[PDB]
Amino acid sequence: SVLVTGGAGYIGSHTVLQLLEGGYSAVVVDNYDNSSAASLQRVKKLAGENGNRLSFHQVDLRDRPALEKIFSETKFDAVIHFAGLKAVGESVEKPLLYYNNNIVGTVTLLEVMAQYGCKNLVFSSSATVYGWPKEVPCTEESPISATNPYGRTKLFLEEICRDVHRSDSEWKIILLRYFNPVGAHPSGYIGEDPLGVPNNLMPYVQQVAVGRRPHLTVFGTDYKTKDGTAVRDYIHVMDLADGHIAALRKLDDLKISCEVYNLGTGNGTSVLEMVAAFEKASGKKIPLVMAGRRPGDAEVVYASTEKAERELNWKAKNGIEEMCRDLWNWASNNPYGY
């Protein structure tokens, strides 16, 4: 039995489905800031028999009575915490919004969790905590420093989790630094369906590919990379989902405390390479506006996979070609989302 925060969202979507399919039970809480209930209806059907073990509610983590009601009626073995705003660029423009939602929401969740004696957490952290890396592939113990308010929320919230653990050794925490999840379930029955104007690269791309946005703005062209565009470690959302189930099994291992794990593929890809990958998979051509660097972006970021392999027995198995096929497969069949 698992509480999934922001589980109507992109990665949450997929992870819930994986939980359901792995024998677990799931309660989702989500305020539908960047998702709708409709995504979980599709996870329900897609999950088949196991779909009877999913239940979901419209709750803001900051609504403490609403969240208390949730933990009242169910004992949680673990919380998986995906809820938050996640856009570097929105961040720089709207810092309070982000410290409000991410830190206040999370602090409330940690407080309620303790109050009801659920003290095992998997936390959605981000490669953004590496800020602008000095070193080729970012290890877990690389220097941690943020560059923008979203980065700082995640960095701050990791430090806050370390502080909780240290205060109270009943707590079992795993911090997962996701690099750049992309793709969809290969069925194409679910996928990324952000509300509002999209912020992430590939939901923006899919929407341009389908008529919903006029062009993709490329953020920066003078980077010190082989084609001038920024480089990221793009990872198949389904691999990312699976790594959460491995986090979950790791939670009651030997003597875990407050462990951090990168979840990436270890390979860097430029924004243009991603475009071109997407165009290969889609056969559609993406109009591009070349713009300046987006405030807050790192230049090259990609994972060390070694710690996650050694300790979670987890590795990503899909490559770019798969991520784009699955995305296109979801996008083709679901051009307006849900």
Add this chain to the structure above:
Amino acid sequence: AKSVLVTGGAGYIGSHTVLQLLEGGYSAVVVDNYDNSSAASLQRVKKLAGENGNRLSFHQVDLRDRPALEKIFSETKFDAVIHFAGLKAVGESVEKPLLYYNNNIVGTVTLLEVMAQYGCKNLVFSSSATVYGWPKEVPCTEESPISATNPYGRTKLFLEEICRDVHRSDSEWKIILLRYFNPVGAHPSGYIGEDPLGVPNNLMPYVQQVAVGRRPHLTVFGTDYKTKDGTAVRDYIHVMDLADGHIAALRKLDDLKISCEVYNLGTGNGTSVLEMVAAFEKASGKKIPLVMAGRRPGDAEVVYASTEKAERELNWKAKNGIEEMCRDLWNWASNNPYGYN
């Protein structure tokens, strides 16, 4: 004709600072939740401010209570906000980090948001020398590396960062981050001073608690340091001089080429824990039984301020020395041994 909201204004530094605002011609509205104070301090500031008492207003309000705070900002054109409110004990922060993060960050964020809503984007923030961490170079300059070593110190580091983010987001904001060193003492009248609720975590309130007989002994946190007496060295400033620094900061806030500046408020001198205990014993005539214990989680070896920048840009320099600090502490305590009764 100037109007100031003081968060945490019932507290040690807030109380003294509110008094100096009043004597200074300012009008002050205080919002406190009496988590670590009582109304008595502001009753007493009123009387002491004399005629200027008429310009003090005090509401009992938690910064996290957004409706209440909106009400306050509705009814009064505030020219600037001094934000003192928060939990401050590093020992408690380690045991209860959520309390600290919750109160300190939710509290501040909600204030920043209400301020921005009602067009009051002038902030003077209670930061702390604790964000200097374990400093490589002393004196500690406003340019030096910043860092925290415990939850409390994280709330100040993180909030400075947030203020910096808010500034970058929105150039209307003018923000001074005041890094207090170690406030000590009381109004020389003896009529007000520090009175924390429950167990004091700061060194000198704990000392005066032992001296009047509330507390059996002072635990010395560290005797194995690389100081002249092996005890931790800090920069202790008269709270009354700290308060004048706020007046200096408010004046400064009315300068064009300001946006988000750090100023140290210290004396620039270091004093061991045992030197402060010796100086208090001289001021009071009391013996302070000492338990020698280990270092406190996060404590720095040596921390004192560079005063250079605050001298040049704020036109402010601490005027009281250690003897004066201990004289007024004792003048307040002797007569109010258990605080506002």
